[PDB]
Write a protein that binds this ligand. Structure first.
Ligand SMILES: [Ca+2]
Ligand SMILES: [Ca+2]
Ligand SMILES: [Ca+2]
Length: 190
């Protein structure tokens, strides 16, 4: 009585491990991966290392890693493995299906990524801002452009902070292959 992750769900959650959290592709998340993530973003947007954007990104990522460790690092080595990661997500999905909200470190990350996408600062991610960011993570442009149209409902919805936040939740927990949120980090062929 209860339940595991479906193949669908597990693979969506491993995809994000591999592409966005494990920046040195060694199979585990560590503070070292976050430092890398920080360099990557500074390079993308041309932020100087000792600036306030950089320093605010670092501070935010520290809180996020602190919350992630608290949630997932069961053997307390300051390293989160795919094992630790999936075990945690199993409980984060269930808790979400029962009304609870996602963990605070996760919402923090979502809001931080929204901010990273929305370089114009107008509270809207546009198609160019979007592919600029996900293409930097190895997502093909054609899967960025298709995903954007899906996410914005072919332009009927503005991808604001709140819309990004809802889509974000749906990516990680939805078991519906027709959900829009499935394509938040590039088109999934389904
Ligand atoms: Ca790593
Ligand atoms: Ca660990
Ligand atoms: Ca914008």
């Amino acid at each position: 009585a209860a339940h595991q992750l479906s193949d669908f769900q597990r693979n969506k959650i491993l995809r994000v491990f591999n592409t966005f959290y494990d920046c040195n592709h060694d199979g585990v998340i560590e503070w070292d991966d976050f430092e890398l993530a920080i360099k990557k973003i500074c390079n993308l947007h041309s932020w100087p290392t000792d600036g306030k954007k950089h320093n605010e990104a670092r501070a935010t990522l520290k809180l996020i890693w602190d919350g992630l460790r608290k949630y997932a690092d069961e053997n307390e080595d300051e390293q989160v493995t795919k094992e630790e990661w999936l075990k945690m997500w199993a409980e984060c999905v269930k808790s979400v299906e029962k009304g609870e909200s996602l963990p605070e470190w996760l919402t923090k990350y979502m809001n931080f990524m929204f901010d990273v996408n929305d370089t114009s600062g107008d509270n809207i991610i546009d198609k160019h801002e979007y592919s600029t960011v996900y293409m930097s993570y190895g997502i093909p442009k054609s899967d960025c452009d298709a995903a954007f149209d899906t996410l914005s409902d072919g332009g009927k919805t503005m991808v604001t902070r709140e819309i990004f936040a809802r889509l974000w939740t749906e990516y990680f927990v939805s078991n519906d292959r027709g959900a829009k949120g499935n394509h938040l980090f590039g088109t999934l062929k389904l």
